[PDB]
């Protein structure tokens, strides 16, 4: 998943394992078992649900 965050006037994007959006400024691990394994993800797509 790719998700963004309000920077206020702009946003910043993240890339990582599947996530769900909770509120307009918060997402969480779409923990379920179908996430692409860390070993297959680029160094640029290792973001965690709470990355800021």
């Amino acid at each position: 998943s790719l998700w963004a965050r309000r920077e206020n006037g702009s946003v910043k994007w993240f890339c990582g394992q599947p996530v769900t959006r909770t509120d307009d400024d918060t997402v969480a691990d779409a923990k379920d078992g179908k996430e692409i394994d860390t070993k297959h993800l680029p160094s640029t797509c290792r973001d965690n649900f709470d990355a800021k």
């Binding site: 070993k39 680029p42 160094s43 640029t44």
Partner: protein, 53 residues
Amino acid sequence: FTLIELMIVIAIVGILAAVALPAYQDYTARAQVSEAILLAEGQKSAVTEYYLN
């Protein structure tokens, strides 16, 4: 009285195997190591990328 050609030639092939024994035994080991090396490599990729990233 006679039969020594069969006796010596069976005993030269016997000693030939004994001389060919250590040659095949390090050529052999040296061959089994050359693979440990191939199995070790090809994993350089993962390690290299992990480090550079």
